[PDB]
Design a protein around this ligand. Sequence first.
Ligand SMILES: CC(=O)N[C@H]1[C@H](O[C@@H]2[C@H](O)[C@@H](O)[C@H](O)O[C@@H]2CO)O[C@H](CO)[C@H](O)[C@@H]1O[C@@H]1O[C@H](CO)[C@H](O)[C@H](O[C@]2(C(=O)O)C[C@H](O)[C@@H](NC(C)=O)[C@H]([C@H](O)[C@@H](CO)O[C@]3(C(=O)O)C[C@H](O)[C@@H](NC(C)=O)[C@H]([C@H](O)[C@H](O)CO)O3)O2)[C@H]1O
Ligand SMILES: CC(=O)N[C@H]1[C@H](O[C@@H]2[C@H](O)[C@@H](O)[C@H](O)O[C@@H]2CO)O[C@H](CO)[C@H](O)[C@@H]1O[C@@H]1O[C@H](CO)[C@H](O)[C@H](O[C@]2(C(=O)O)C[C@H](O)[C@@H](NC(C)=O)[C@H]([C@H](O)[C@@H](CO)O[C@]3(C(=O)O)C[C@H](O)[C@@H](NC(C)=O)[C@H]([C@H](O)[C@H](O)CO)O3)O2)[C@H]1O
Ligand SMILES: CC(=O)N[C@H]1[C@H](O[C@@H]2[C@H](O)[C@@H](O)[C@H](O)O[C@@H]2CO)O[C@H](CO)[C@H](O)[C@@H]1O[C@@H]1O[C@H](CO)[C@H](O)[C@H](O[C@]2(C(=O)O)C[C@H](O)[C@@H](NC(C)=O)[C@H]([C@H](O)[C@@H](CO)O[C@]3(C(=O)O)C[C@H](O)[C@@H](NC(C)=O)[C@H]([C@H](O)[C@H](O)CO)O3)O2)[C@H]1O
Ligand SMILES: CC(=O)N[C@H]1[C@H](O[C@@H]2[C@H](O)[C@@H](O)[C@H](O)O[C@@H]2CO)O[C@H](CO)[C@H](O)[C@@H]1O[C@@H]1O[C@H](CO)[C@H](O)[C@H](O[C@]2(C(=O)O)C[C@H](O)[C@@H](NC(C)=O)[C@H]([C@H](O)[C@@H](CO)O[C@]3(C(=O)O)C[C@H](O)[C@@H](NC(C)=O)[C@H]([C@H](O)[C@H](O)CO)O3)O2)[C@H]1O
Ligand SMILES: CC(=O)N[C@H]1[C@H](O[C@@H]2[C@H](O)[C@@H](O)[C@H](O)O[C@@H]2CO)O[C@H](CO)[C@H](O)[C@@H]1O[C@@H]1O[C@H](CO)[C@H](O)[C@H](O[C@]2(C(=O)O)C[C@H](O)[C@@H](NC(C)=O)[C@H]([C@H](O)[C@@H](CO)O[C@]3(C(=O)O)C[C@H](O)[C@@H](NC(C)=O)[C@H]([C@H](O)[C@H](O)CO)O3)O2)[C@H]1O
Lengths: 280, 279, 284, 279, 280
Amino acid sequence: GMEVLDLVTGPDSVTEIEAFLNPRMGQPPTPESLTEGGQYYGWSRGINLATSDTEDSPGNNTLPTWSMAKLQLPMLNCDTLQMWEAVSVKTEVVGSGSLLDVHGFNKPTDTVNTKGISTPVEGSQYHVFAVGGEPLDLQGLVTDARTKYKEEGVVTIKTITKKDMVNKDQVLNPISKAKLDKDGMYPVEIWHPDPAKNENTRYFGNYTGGTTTPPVLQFTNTLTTVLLDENGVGPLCKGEGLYLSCVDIMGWRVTRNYDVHHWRGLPRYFKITLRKRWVK
Amino acid sequence: GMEVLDLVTGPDSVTEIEAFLNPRMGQPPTPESLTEGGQYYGWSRGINLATSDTEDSPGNNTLPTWSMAKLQLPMLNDTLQMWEAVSVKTEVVGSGSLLDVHGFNKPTDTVNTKGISTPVEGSQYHVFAVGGEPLDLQGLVTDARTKYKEEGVVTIKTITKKDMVNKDQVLNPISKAKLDKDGMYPVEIWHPDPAKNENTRYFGNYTGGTTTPPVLQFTNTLTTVLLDENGVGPLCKGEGLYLSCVDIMGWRVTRNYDVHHWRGLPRYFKITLRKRWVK
Amino acid sequence: GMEVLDLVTGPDSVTEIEAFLNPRMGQPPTPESLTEGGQYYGWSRGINLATSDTEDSPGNNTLPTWSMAKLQLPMLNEDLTCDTLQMWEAVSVKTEVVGSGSLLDVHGFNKPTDTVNTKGISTPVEGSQYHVFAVGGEPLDLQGLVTDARTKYKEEGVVTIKTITKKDMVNKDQVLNPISKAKLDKDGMYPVEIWHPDPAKNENTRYFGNYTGGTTTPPVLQFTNTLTTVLLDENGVGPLCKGEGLYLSCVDIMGWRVTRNYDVHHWRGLPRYFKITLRKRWVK
Amino acid sequence: GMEVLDLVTGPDSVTEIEAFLNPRMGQPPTPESLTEGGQYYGWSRGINLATSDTEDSPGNNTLPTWSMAKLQLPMLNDTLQMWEAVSVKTEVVGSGSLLDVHGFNKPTDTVNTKGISTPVEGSQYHVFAVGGEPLDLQGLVTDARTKYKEEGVVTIKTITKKDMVNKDQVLNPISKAKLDKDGMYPVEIWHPDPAKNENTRYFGNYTGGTTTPPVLQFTNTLTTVLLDENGVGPLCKGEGLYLSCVDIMGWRVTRNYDVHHWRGLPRYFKITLRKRWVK
Amino acid sequence: GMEVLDLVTGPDSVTEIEAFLNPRMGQPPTPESLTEGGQYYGWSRGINLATSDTEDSPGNNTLPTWSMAKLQLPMLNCDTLQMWEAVSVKTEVVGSGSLLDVHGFNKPTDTVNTKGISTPVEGSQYHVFAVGGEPLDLQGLVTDARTKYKEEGVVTIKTITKKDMVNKDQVLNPISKAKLDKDGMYPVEIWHPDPAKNENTRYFGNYTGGTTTPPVLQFTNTLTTVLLDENGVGPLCKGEGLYLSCVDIMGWRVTRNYDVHHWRGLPRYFKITLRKRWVK
Ligand SMILES: CC(=O)N[C@H]1[C@H](O[C@@H]2[C@H](O)[C@@H](O)[C@H](O)O[C@@H]2CO)O[C@H](CO)[C@H](O)[C@@H]1O[C@@H]1O[C@H](CO)[C@H](O)[C@H](O[C@]2(C(=O)O)C[C@H](O)[C@@H](NC(C)=O)[C@H]([C@H](O)[C@@H](CO)O[C@]3(C(=O)O)C[C@H](O)[C@@H](NC(C)=O)[C@H]([C@H](O)[C@H](O)CO)O3)O2)[C@H]1O
Ligand SMILES: CC(=O)N[C@H]1[C@H](O[C@@H]2[C@H](O)[C@@H](O)[C@H](O)O[C@@H]2CO)O[C@H](CO)[C@H](O)[C@@H]1O[C@@H]1O[C@H](CO)[C@H](O)[C@H](O[C@]2(C(=O)O)C[C@H](O)[C@@H](NC(C)=O)[C@H]([C@H](O)[C@@H](CO)O[C@]3(C(=O)O)C[C@H](O)[C@@H](NC(C)=O)[C@H]([C@H](O)[C@H](O)CO)O3)O2)[C@H]1O
Ligand SMILES: CC(=O)N[C@H]1[C@H](O[C@@H]2[C@H](O)[C@@H](O)[C@H](O)O[C@@H]2CO)O[C@H](CO)[C@H](O)[C@@H]1O[C@@H]1O[C@H](CO)[C@H](O)[C@H](O[C@]2(C(=O)O)C[C@H](O)[C@@H](NC(C)=O)[C@H]([C@H](O)[C@@H](CO)O[C@]3(C(=O)O)C[C@H](O)[C@@H](NC(C)=O)[C@H]([C@H](O)[C@H](O)CO)O3)O2)[C@H]1O
Ligand SMILES: CC(=O)N[C@H]1[C@H](O[C@@H]2[C@H](O)[C@@H](O)[C@H](O)O[C@@H]2CO)O[C@H](CO)[C@H](O)[C@@H]1O[C@@H]1O[C@H](CO)[C@H](O)[C@H](O[C@]2(C(=O)O)C[C@H](O)[C@@H](NC(C)=O)[C@H]([C@H](O)[C@@H](CO)O[C@]3(C(=O)O)C[C@H](O)[C@@H](NC(C)=O)[C@H]([C@H](O)[C@H](O)CO)O3)O2)[C@H]1O
Ligand SMILES: CC(=O)N[C@H]1[C@H](O[C@@H]2[C@H](O)[C@@H](O)[C@H](O)O[C@@H]2CO)O[C@H](CO)[C@H](O)[C@@H]1O[C@@H]1O[C@H](CO)[C@H](O)[C@H](O[C@]2(C(=O)O)C[C@H](O)[C@@H](NC(C)=O)[C@H]([C@H](O)[C@@H](CO)O[C@]3(C(=O)O)C[C@H](O)[C@@H](NC(C)=O)[C@H]([C@H](O)[C@H](O)CO)O3)O2)[C@H]1O
């Protein structure tokens, strides 16, 4: 599919597919038990801090990771073949209204009397989505190349290189690249969309920092994101696979015990419109 | 009405309907008495907090719920006609009332008990929808362990007849409902379902925090087009038009242990509809 | 005059008129004396607080009210029995809130920023802000809605819900009660914490409003002589001036200053300029 | 030159002129000495406060004033020609200098005298104007009782020859002036007059507060068109072009009694002009 | 040539080049050792403060400087010649997700119990990029003309003028000009894009101040910045050299030792589209 030709016409030349991607904040979907850890699903476990300038060992279940799904498209296939082309996406982050629960057991707004309301989710927020015809290309970049990430259960820079991180990993080191090929495995504090690749994926991201920052979110079923490039060509789905990637961090809740923070994430809906494209 | 055809022309082919939806913050419209609870109408009652990690039992009158109304349209009927909602002018009314800083709220100077009465601040939530059938709802909660009352509110357990599961803290497609009753569906549980709502347009925003300044714009000059990408608006099944909304401005805080009360404001809708031939 | 026809052409068929509306924050324009109360003009008097959950009696001079003016345009119709008549149509307005630069005075005697030493700067105006303007061919239609139906507004000196209904406020007045309606027919009388533009009426008026809350919120304002607000509706028709009367309405609250005595707050308002372009329209 | 006719064509019919206007925050450009006061150039001197409700006497060197320049254009003259200002590229230069947090300002850790030197913060005011005559000014003050110096600043009393009146705290049409001198008209007194300025375009914004983060954008790719609704730009009377501005970024705060100094930045103008036939 | 004619057509008449510029916050890329100073790469060293109103001498490694690169373009070139013209650029700041590391050893959010989270990067932010056919023209302007900048290892106003700064250097002094001709050498608190020059460069900048201000950033591979002027002419590359300039400061991290601040910068990606232009 090097040369892109005419749009395919006729019955079933256009298709629409939908999916939701649940957040991957740290606690896995199982155990389902609401006493055995399932109560943290949708959240991270309590963020654990470095014990010195040289001893930073975050728990896997404290690190939000990328969500991803590979969706199978209808079968297609002569020198001239057909590919599915992603034209547009309607995407929405669902559940912001749930943050209006200020009646729980979080750190209260009046700490003097332990009264007021249960402090709502606040702070650093991170929203990225991508739609592509192959896995999202990732570029590694970390706060601290000395961070001692677990070897098992997360894919980190050392997983790829088979070597410890180097100081260049705190800036742009082109050696430290990966592909988003697994859900709930690639930490978002390590792996970023690679602007030097991703020719066949469109991604859109934003970051707002701070500690008590009010979370902001909009949602509507009326907004379409066009995925066509400058030449009018959308992502082309290699082997009829469509890749969806996202992360939607709303901030942290804070407990009444030593200000322990838990990340909060929300699920993202995708509705992708695709059309068949003649290719050579 | 599966196939959408031409616009109907001629006498009475276009109509306009207006409505206001009052907020449903927790205190019901009655009793009307300003000593017996009526003084809280437009507000929630005092937000009560969980007593432990496993004991979260919010009062029904502390939980803002969706406002909704079903409006009856003029009677109509191989080829039939349906009312098509083309546009809406909608406005949230009464933000100027938040300029009352002369009441008995927590004062701005708590050291001396002086200053002004702290105005409404904090988390804000504005959603409206216009559709030809009830708004489709998707459940999602902060805490699947929350012990909502069984009577007086429609919650996930009302629908499933079973306790919430951990998946209800993310997207669980089992936990769905329709917004078919005013003042019954808590907004901390029920969200517009993006997987459905083919015949409704909804528009929402959330701003969080505790002391966040509330922001609101209002004008009679703004029109929201309801037509989809094919130029087709919501089609009104059985000549019923559904309006849905919630408009939370934040909380007021009292001088007694910082008790918070939600504040909501009413929303005006003016919908323009036209007759559409369907087959 | 309800069927709207062609635009009138010829000498004097288009006019521009200008006006400024001074703010009505609580202190009246008189007395002019800078010792006898005039020093508060442009501001409210010190905001007084409720003494209990059931005793909220704000002073009239602590309540900002709507500014309004009715401008009389040149008479058009010698004979109102003519089949086709003319009306003035408001096409557009250039409007501006003047004097935000004055808020850069941080050398006065407000609560200072260094409270240990009574030093630093005089705290500038901050907090809740409210900006609304309207241009119409009849009075702005108002809808009442209050924080507290129990608020004991004075009977004399302000037009409130009770002024209209002749009865005490009801709990529904804390939400939308369609009984509680009025028209903005007098300057400096209708409190902005009570009376809001009525979206169910105002067919012949355009209004534009915004609110930003909080207590120490930085005030924000833009001003330029290059911005035109179009007043034409979706059908290309502006407000039509009934009996050649043009109605201007506004409120422009910038926040409060805070004194050195028990954190007493005074509302600050600024004046608004209007330059309205009008044209003659044939009607029947 | 009342009636505006065709654009003039031919050699030298279009010209571009550039200028920078330095801020006028209170310390004059001289003395240049970095020990005898010149170290405050680009800043005000320390803001001095009223001593009572009736004694507010600010120092001239504590009051930011309008910057202005009159630029002479190329010589021109029934049908005459005038220079017409078509557009302007304008930019506030030096925001990067606010990234100096290594100085001796009030530190972020006042307990230990550690952290960083607090950067410039607070109230911000940006206005620029381009016209064919002086910017028309309308006076309006916080306090008509303020005792401005008679010499060294142009204030309302300078114009009227009488003390300010209470109406000067709102809009008093008597209190008008023209911006005809650089570094003389305080910005807390004198505002662009929207009832005049038919031959000037002005653009302003204000953001208040005490610790507000300053915000600024800059690019050489943005052009401000100066043409009115009829396609006519400011027409330069007697071939004079007037530039006016003020660009306040906030205050720095010292380690002694929180003394505040205003910070201003310079503004660049590149104006495109064309000759216009007039009669 | 200074007269701009038609666009060149035919084989290889258009080219695309890409580059990343790593931030220059104060610590140089070497030593690479994560114990010998390399751990600060991507950051400044600890900001040192003035000791009096007349003694302000910042360490060079505490001052963020401009990043720049000169890229060589394909060789060109009787009377009419050709030049490379920069048409557009896609540019992105990479790695904001790394600021979601709140598990380190920064000053904690709960200083009573030394708990909560590791305070994320916050405060003053500064983002500028430029693309041009010659070095970015710089105009000097400082907070304090008395600042004792080091004479070695950095280019300051005194480097250029061979004289001490004067009071006019705190406003616009037209004598105090330079060109951005070296990477990691021109402090951003001294040197600003010069709006009186730069006829052959486009620059775009923003500043947000404060001390605890939440950092904000957007990133996408779908945004193109057009570099053509009002006449449809992009920067023309003198001697086939393309100049890229930037700085991307995200704020500071604060340590647990006397609130020491370290600047944080992030790398910027550029993808520039160029076309050949006939000139006379
Ligand atoms: C329990 C513990 O100390 N775990 C730490 C672990 O210890 C190992 C082992 O588990 C121990 O048995 C043994 O003594 O020691 C070994 C190690 O030598 O070691 C880990 C590193 O190797 C971690 O340090 C781990 O500590 C946990 O670390 C995570 C991050 O990775 C979190 O920081 C976690 O903090 C939380 C959490 O779980 O997220 C924060 C949260 O806010 C707390 N919730 C509340 C309401 O306070 C919980 C809470 O303290 C947990 C501790 O596990 O207690 C409960 C719970 O409420 O979740 C108590 C429940 O009664 C229990 N349920 C039942 C049916 O018994 C429940 C359940 O065990 C777990 O949820 C299962 O995962 O735990 O802590 C931090 O504790
Ligand atoms: C009164 C009470 O204790 N109610 C709680 C209820 O108790 C039950 C019963 O009412 C008691 O008599 C008996 O002893 O116990 C049973 C049950 O064991 O139990 C409920 C759960 O089943 C709740 O716990 C309930 O407490 C109330 O809960 C709601 C949330 O659901 C609120 O948190 C409420 O707090 C407020 C409120 O009403 O919203 C907060 C508000 O800020 C307070 N207002 C002020 C000005 O302080 C009020 C206030 O404390 C109420 C308490 O009811 O007192 C007034 C009032 O001001 O509203 C006092 C008036 O004098 C009274 N009017 C008259 C004519 O007597 C008025 C009126 O009764 C009610 O408004 C009618 O609903 O109440 O509390 C929290 O109290
Ligand atoms: C003075 C007083 O107590 N007034 C209250 C009023 O009392 C009535 C009557 O005036 C009294 O003589 C008598 O003893 O009692 C009767 C009835 O009880 O009763 C009212 C209710 O019926 C009010 O409670 C009123 O209090 C005033 O209420 C208003 C709101 O409606 C304000 O809150 C006001 O507070 C301010 C104000 O005037 O806005 C706040 C302001 O920040 C203060 N200014 C300063 C610099 O501190 C002023 C100030 O304290 C006033 C109080 O009147 O004193 C001055 C002034 O500075 O304005 C002092 C001047 O010397 C004086 N001028 C001359 C020439 O003598 C000047 C002048 O009288 C008034 O400005 C004219 O209106 O007053 O208070 C709050 O006081
Ligand atoms: C010094 C003084 O008291 N000045 C006030 C003046 O007093 C007059 C006279 O100077 C006295 O000797 C005599 O006793 O009284 C007469 C008349 O009363 O009276 C004025 C009113 O008429 C003012 O009140 C004046 O006070 C000054 O007012 C301005 C506002 O108009 C400022 O608020 C100023 O405060 C600053 C300032 O200069 O901006 C604030 C600044 O943050 C301070 N800087 C530092 C580093 O602390 C300075 C500083 O305190 C000044 C005071 O003048 O000291 C230096 C300086 O650092 O600038 C010290 C230097 O050593 C000196 N240079 C040399 C070579 O000796 C330098 C220099 O004199 C001046 O800059 C020249 O203008 O002053 O204060 C406030 O002081
Ligand atoms: C160490 C010192 O005092 N340096 C100052 C310097 O002293 C001179 C000379 O270099 C010294 O060796 C000798 O003892 O004394 C002379 C004369 O006094 O003089 C300079 C002026 O010319 C400076 O004042 C210099 O101070 C340093 O200045 C920079 C800014 O220019 C910074 O402010 C720096 O502070 C930091 C920093 O390095 O950025 C702040 C940071 O937050 C701190 N980090 C931590 C985790 O606390 C570090 C830290 O204190 C450094 C001090 O050098 O210690 C380590 C480190 O953690 O980085 C400790 C490590 O064990 C060590 N590595 C090894 C293998 O031993 C490591 C390494 O030496 C350096 O990083 C290499 O550059 O240093 O300070 C401020 O100290």
